Design a protein around this ligand. Structure first.
Ligand SMILES: NC(=O)c1ccc[n+]([C@@H]2O[C@H](COP(=O)([O-])OP(=O)(O)OC[C@H]3O[C@@H](n4cnc5c(N)ncnc54)[C@H](O)[C@@H]3O)[C@@H](O)[C@H]2O)c1
Ligand SMILES: NC(=O)c1ccc[n+]([C@@H]2O[C@H](COP(=O)([O-])OP(=O)(O)OC[C@H]3O[C@@H](n4cnc5c(N)ncnc54)[C@H](O)[C@@H]3O)[C@@H](O)[C@H]2O)c1
Lengths: 708, 238
């Protein structure tokens, strides 16, 4: 044949037309690794010499079309000097550019998923035919960068500036229908007919029916927009993205600034702008952090396959409660396809459950995001009940009863008598030991812990607590059932505060100290929200509730006296003893009539202000982060979270740790494990919560890191 | 238009038009003369006195109806033993009007078909602009699926939609009478089986009658209230 590699095969066809198929033998998918880029290089130079060629049809042998290159190779590439990296793309784009300048009609047959470079490959061609069951997109920004293979150059000139900015700034996948509307694709057809679709199109281009020279021109010249129109087209785009993304993520805006510069240049100079920015984003202390999450994700998926080998699918769920958490768990379960029961002792309870569970679905139907036909299905899965008569075939039960060991033991025990013996039980408690609530059951093996957060339909994380009597199957089942509800489960060994709560309070401890140190809390959370946190420590205490942050404190005290005990009076107490209970009460650090600073609190926080020490912003960051990080370190050394990746992702979903930072542990790596220790000694005068561990000090000497 | 959607059998509909058509160029006086003239012509037609007779019979019905309401109980908690075709329909009509109805079935697949068609109806109107989603929720909340008789503790009336089989119906109804209250009223939806026969199984046939719905349950008006030899007036009235 004309060409034959290990991932690319160029076979000749009728009327001189030749097909260039991407089939990476051995692997499952296709991607632009070091090999493919080289083979495509030769393939092009081959077609560039073969005079019998009359057209080129790019196809795919695998299921998917062409996805992004290996994530592993990305990291390896983003360490090289800026000069070397730019040369890597300058020569890369040249390949696709040659296929574009090819004096012959070219068409891409998108049979399946075409992401990242995959879509960029197609963009290089003239025409594009897509299978209705396929999806295309540029999820480059999901890593802190933007299209590097001419994406930010060909798309804007092909589908328009605005539409391009969207496709790039969001990195969302696009269905067949929408793909054609924006003209990202020239035609959509059934999977089976996609073949002839390309062939028939080629002939209609060679003859001259479809002027391919004119359809290729657009992405080889300046944008069609006016100078004035450009001013708006970009500035508004910038203002929009910056207001829904945040100054913390450069990629989203950089993409716009790139298209804005090349707005008056051809392909060549546009590519120079693309690569220039690509290198800048590849070095950010946010990019590789997001890339780290991608790694932690893959680690979670592999471990996920482990639990998926002994987890029985929950085709019939059931929760013991309603209203707030009970109703939520009943919602999520149904919203994903799992008939969940709603048990309650009184009818009024089931009322509240179905109530809020209704305002959610209807809340979207009255906005155009969900079909009523679907709302029905979801409302049919939820089956209210006042007796255990329907628990005959439940695969897993979740207890949402109030915090009370005595009660929980009487309830769980009563349920174990109605449910099957292989059925798995679970608790949603947040301040009570599972190993304690497990000594009531006659089969503690099938008992674990499923901790959801408030709101149940908003928070991702779902800790899978494992009691001393818990089995692997019990844990695995919970994980699968959690993942099936579109969540992010992470196994955690039973301990006061578990993972999230165990790190949340030590973090709040630094806050309490700040307040007692005469530090204006309004300023504190202003530096934290600037640090990246969604809500500042102060404003957070209101969302959760002072009455809640108070009880949780006592639990962590009796749990870890060696470093989490406190005998003085913190601002947390000054409020609990002032009838101030948070956002629910309308009174906390702020006033909630939606967030105002009221001076009527100064008269209450006085009894807490001890010294009057000075302090900058960099200090506040350490007075808060050091405890949180160090505690996370303990939640790994003591043996709670199986790995470091799971430890960080646990906070990324539960506490809402800044994404552009990677996580608590990775944060230490960012500053350096060794350098972090020194940062801990400077403020070590604040308690055991600021003293590194013997293991943290040791690994600081060897130079090792959490994600080395 | 009217002649094609009414039929040559009903004069009134068309005569009204012909009347307005004649007075189309007259004042009030001459128009009234055309009105009365046609009124007399229709008052003598055979379709007239018949339709008048229908309403004449309607009054007698409502009068008898009032006799029932003097001892009838308001089922604030209904329940049907079935789904799919008739079961789901009965569960729909009951909810669509304001009556929490249960849906009992021996298998999960059955409750599926029931809620399925019961949903295609409500959504079938919301996706056209005739019903508020807020109302669709209320209706779908009244219907409570179940595989056990654990929730029949407060049902005021039960409707059996089980397959046509005397042997089976007797075992089912008998099993229900043990969970429901003693004052609770039972009912069969059978169409080709004797009620007096299906009643010899219950220990309290007095509270048993017959409620015959039609297909589709949400379209057909008539609902025959069969009375067995052992049926009571209160049972029928309810
Ligand atoms: N602050 C929060 O919102 C938050 C955050 C995280 C975790 N949680 C967890 O949520 C749980 C509290 O649930 P809630 O918010 O619904 O409390 P709630 O007081 O709002 O509602 C309690 C509901 O449980 C029902 N119930 C009580 N005992 C029952 C039993 N034996 N069987 C069946 N139903 C029973 C009641 O009838 C009532 O409907 C706790 O485990 C708590 O740790 C709450
Ligand atoms: N042809 C019609 O559509 C029609 C017309 C008039 C009257 N009917 C009456 O309707 C009734 C039949 O209902 P259908 O049309 O839905 O039949 P169907 O076959 O469509 O559905 C039967 C349903 O009853 C359930 N069922 C059977 N035995 C049960 C038991 N012991 N406990 C609980 N659930 C049980 C099944 O699971 C199933 O969901 C009969 O009384 C029949 O005379 C039907």
């Amino acid at each position: 044949m004309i060409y034959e590699g290990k991932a690319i095969t160029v076979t000749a066809l009728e009327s001189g037309i030749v097909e260039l198929k991407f089939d990476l033998k051995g692997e499952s998918v296709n991607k632009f690794n070091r090999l493919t880029l080289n083979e495509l290089r030769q393939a092009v130079d081959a077609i560039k010499a073969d005079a019998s060629v009359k057209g080129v049809i790019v196809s795919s042998g695998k299921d998917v079309f062409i996805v992004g290159a290996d994530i592993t190779e990305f990291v390896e590439n983003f360490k090289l000097p800026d000069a070397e990296l730019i040369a890597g793309n300058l020569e890369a784009n040249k390949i696709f550019s040659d296929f574009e300048d090819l004096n012959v009609p070219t068409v891409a047959a998108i049979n399946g998923i075409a992401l990242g470079g995959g879509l960029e490959m197609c963009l290089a061609a003239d025409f594009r035919v897509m299978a209705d069951s396929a999806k295309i997109g540029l999820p480059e920004v999901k890593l802190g960068i933007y299209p590097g293979f001419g994406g930010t150059v060909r798309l804007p000139r092909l589908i328009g500036v605005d539409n391009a900015v969207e496709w790039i700034a969001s990195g969302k996948e696009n269905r067949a229908e929408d793909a054609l509307k924006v003209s990202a694709v020239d035609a959509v057809v059934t999977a089976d007919k996609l073949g002839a679709a390309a062939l028939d199109l080629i002939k209609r281009a060679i003859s001259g029916e479809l002027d391919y020279k004119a359809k290729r021109q657009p992405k080889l010249e300046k944008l069609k927009l006016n100078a004035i129109e450009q001013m708006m087209a970009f500035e508004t785009a910038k203002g929009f993205v910056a207001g829904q993304a945040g100054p913390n993520y450069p990629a989203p805006v950089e993409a716009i600034k790139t298209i804005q510069k090349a707005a008056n240049f051809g392909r060549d100079k546009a590519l120079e702008v693309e690569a220039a920015g690509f290198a800048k984003l590849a070095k950010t202390s946010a990019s590789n952090c997001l890339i780290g999450l991608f790694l932690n994700d893959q680690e979670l998926k592999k471990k996920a396959k482990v639990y998926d080998k002994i987890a029985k699918d929950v085709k019939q769920a059931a929760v013991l409660g309603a209203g707030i958490m009970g109703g939520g768990i009943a919602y999520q379960s149904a919203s994903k396809g799992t008939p969940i029961l709603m048990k309650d002792i009184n009818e009024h309870g089931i009322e509240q459950g179905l109530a809020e569970a209704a305002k959610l679905l209807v809340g979207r139907v009255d906005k155009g995001r969900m079909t009523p036909a679907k709302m029905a299905e979801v409302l049919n899965g939820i089956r209210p009940t006042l007796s255990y008569g329907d628990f005959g075939n439940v695969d897993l039960v979740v207890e949402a009863v109030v915090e009370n060991p005595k009660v929980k033991q009487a309830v769980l025990a009563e349920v174990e008598n109605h449910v099957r013996e292989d059925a798995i039980l679970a608790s949603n408690t947040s301040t009570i030991s599972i190993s304690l609530l497990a000594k009531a059951l006659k089969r503690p093996e099938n008992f674990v812990g499923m901790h959801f957060f408030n709101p149940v339909h908003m928070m991702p994380l779902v800790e899978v607590i494992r009691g001393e009597k818990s089995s692997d199957l019990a844990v695995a089942t919970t994980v699968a059932y959690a993942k099936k509800m579109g969540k992010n489960p992470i196994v955690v060994n039973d301990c006061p505060g578990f993972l999230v709560n165990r790190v949340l309070f030590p973090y709040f401890g630094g806050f309490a100290k700040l307040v007692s140190a005469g530090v204006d809390f309004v300023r504190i959370d202003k530096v934290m929200e600037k640090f990246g946190w969604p809500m500042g420590p102060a404003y957070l205490m209101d969302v959760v509730g002072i009455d809640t942050g108070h009880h949780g404190r006592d639990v962590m005290a009796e749990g870890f006296p060696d470093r989490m005990k406190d005998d003085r009076r913190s601002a947390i107490d000054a409020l609990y003893e002032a009838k101030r209970l948070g956002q629910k009460n309308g009174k906390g650090f702020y006033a909630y009539e939606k967030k105002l600073v009221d001076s009527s609190v100064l008269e209450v926080l006085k009894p807490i202000v001890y010294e009057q020490r000075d302090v900058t912003d960099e200090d506040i960051i350490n007075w808060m982060m050091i405890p949180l990080c160090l505690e996370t370190v303990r939640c790994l050394e003591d043996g709670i979270v199986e790995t470091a990746a799971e430890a960080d992702m646990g906070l990324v979903y539960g506490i809402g740790f800044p994404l552009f930072r990677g996580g608590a542990l990775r944060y230490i790596d960012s500053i350096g494990v060794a350098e972090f220790v020194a940062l801990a000694d400077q403020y070590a005068e604040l308690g055991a919560l600021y003293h590194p561990t013997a293991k943290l000090r040791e690994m600081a000497k060897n130079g090792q890191s959490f994600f080395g």
